[PDB]
Amino acid sequence: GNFLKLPDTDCRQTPPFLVLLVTSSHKQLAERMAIRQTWGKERMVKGKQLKTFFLLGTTSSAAETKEVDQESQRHGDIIQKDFLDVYYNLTLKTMMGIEWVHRFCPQAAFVMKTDSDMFINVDYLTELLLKKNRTTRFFTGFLKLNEFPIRQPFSKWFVSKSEYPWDRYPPFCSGTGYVFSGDVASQVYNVSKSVPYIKLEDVFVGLCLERLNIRLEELHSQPTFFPGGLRFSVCLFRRIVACHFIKPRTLLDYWQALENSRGEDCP
Ligand SMILES: CC(=O)N[C@H]1[C@H](O[C@H]2[C@@H](O)[C@@H](CO)O[C@H](O[C@@H]3[C@H](O)[C@@H](O)[C@H](O[C@H]4[C@H](O)[C@@H](O)[C@H](O)O[C@@H]4CO)O[C@@H]3CO)[C@@H]2O)O[C@H](CO)[C@H](O)[C@@H]1O[C@@H]1O[C@H](CO)[C@H](O)[C@H](O)[C@H]1O
Ligand SMILES: *[C@@H]1O[C@H](CO[C@@H]2O[C@@H](C)[C@@H](O)[C@@H](O)[C@@H]2O)[C@@H](O[C@@H]2O[C@H](CO)[C@@H](O)[C@H](O)[C@H]2NC(C)=O)[C@H](O)[C@H]1NC(C)=O
Ligand SMILES: *[C@@H]1O[C@H](CO)[C@@H](O[C@@H]2O[C@H](CO)[C@@H](O)[C@H](O)[C@H]2NC(C)=O)[C@H](O)[C@H]1NC(C)=O
Ligand SMILES: O=c1ccn([C@@H]2O[C@H](COP(=O)(O)OP(=O)(O)O)[C@@H](O)[C@H]2O)c(=O)[nH]1
Numbered sequence: 577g578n579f580l581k582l583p584d585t586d587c588r589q590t591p592p593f594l595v596l597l598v599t600s601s602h603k604q605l606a607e608r609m610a611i612r613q614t615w616g617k618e619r620m621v622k623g624k625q626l627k628t629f630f631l632l633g634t635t636s637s638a639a640e641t642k643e644v645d646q647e648s649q650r651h652g653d654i655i656q657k658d659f660l661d662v663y664y665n666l667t668l669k670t671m672m673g674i675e676w677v678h679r680f681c682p683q684a685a686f687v688m689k690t691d692s693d694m695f696i697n698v699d700y701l702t703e704l705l706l707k708k709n710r711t712t713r714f715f716t717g718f719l720k721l722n723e724f725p726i727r728q729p730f731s732k733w734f735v736s737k738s739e740y741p742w743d744r745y746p747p748f749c750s751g752t753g754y755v756f757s758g759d760v761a762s763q764v765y766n767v768s769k770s771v772p773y774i775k776l777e778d779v780f781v782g783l784c785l786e787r788l789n790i791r792l793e794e795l796h797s798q799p800t801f802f803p804g805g806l807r808f809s810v811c812l813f814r815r816i817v818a819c820h821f822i823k824p825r826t827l828l829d830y831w832q833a834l835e836n837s838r839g840e841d842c843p
């Protein structure tokens with residue numbers, strides 16, 4: 577498939593229950609280490625396997641290239657292809673991850689694409705997924721259903737009319753973190769080259785899902801994905817899946833808080 581780095585894993589032998597694909601730039605080693613030490617640590621969750629991989633492109637910086645080569649060798653959990661790893665190539669990055677699931681891990685029951693400035697509660701997510709009774713054509717997250725493209729020309733998420741010429745975006749889920757059954761990867765990969773390209777990855781996946789007639793659904797009767805962030809508390813964070821706006825030091829402190837308070841009951 578044209579990959580420069582492949583994780584040392586065999587999904588055929590031991591099909592994972594949940595695969596996390598984490599986006600981060602080359603310089604964000606601190607993010608990746610914090611994740612590896614917290615919600616990214618591979619383990620059995622209620623007897624289900626969790627696997628965690630980091631998606632990277634390439635960079636022009638020789639120093640960063642060497643750093644990442646060393647990191648891959650040391651940890652063996654990086655998925656890499658030869659594309660310039662910049663914000664406006666995130667669509668390529670996401671498609672790389674999806675391509676990977678399709679080629680080397682179609683046995684994954686579920687896949688979460690997530691960002692690195694995130695807190696993820698894998699235990700509660702696994703509980704809600706096992707409760708959902710859905711194993712195919714399943715896609716959930718924070719649903720963004722009547723979105724309009726941002727036309728402010730200097731905005732981080734600006735798209736011109738030539739980049740995206742219609743008044744509304746398809747239904748899609750926030751790219752801060754979304755979850756889908758493993759089969760969905762193959763479908764999206766198959767259809768991706770025939771769907772109009774857009775440089776916003778979560779929107780592009782929404783376009784693919786729309787072409788596939790895959791409907792978005794809420795994971796639970798209460799909201800569980802929070803792209804806007806949250807005021808922290810142990811009891812709240814025990815009953816959410818994903819929270820945005822979390823820098824590495826904060827992630828480590830929050831993980832510590834959950835460990836320090838394990839075994840206490842919550843209202
Ligand atoms: C982080 C996030 O959720 N970003 C996604 C973005 O969300 C925004 C949209 O839904 C718009 C639509 O109304 O509302 C929200 O933001 C509005 C406004 O549009 C923003 O411009 C503004 O934020 C800026 C402000 O404009 C600046 O002046 C100021 O300096 O900074 C602030 C914050 O940076 O805020 C208001 C209220 O928050 C909402 O945040 O929607 C995008 C598509 O249009 C994307 O979905 C984007 O998500 C990221 O997209 C990339 C695409 O490659 C990846 O999927 C990332 O993983 C994903 O996080
Ligand atoms: C998911 O299913 C569970 C289990 O229910 C069984 O399997 C399902 C696929 C469906 O065919 C059910 O009719 C089966 O009974 C559901 O949780 C059950 O609900 C019962 C009664 O409401 C309750 O005692 C327990 O919660 C569960 N019982 C058993 C036998 O497991 C659950 O509601 C289903 N979830 C969704 C999202 O539909
Ligand atoms: C996304 O990545 C691609 C692949 O690296 C970039 O395309 C290359 O860009 C370099 C210069 O930046 C050229 O020398 C290559 O010829 C290009 N190759 C291909 C296959 O396109 C692309 O520029 C990146 N996108 C953005 C917005 O930076
Ligand atoms: O060149 C880049 C820029 C960003 N990102 C990742 O893409 C996600 C979105 O970045 P950011 O939080 O800046 O986007 P925002 O949520 O503010 O839209 C994050 O996990 C970044 O680490 C990446 O992999 N490569």
Ligand SMILES: [Mn+2]
Nearest residue numbers: 691693820821
């Ligand atoms: Mn972010």
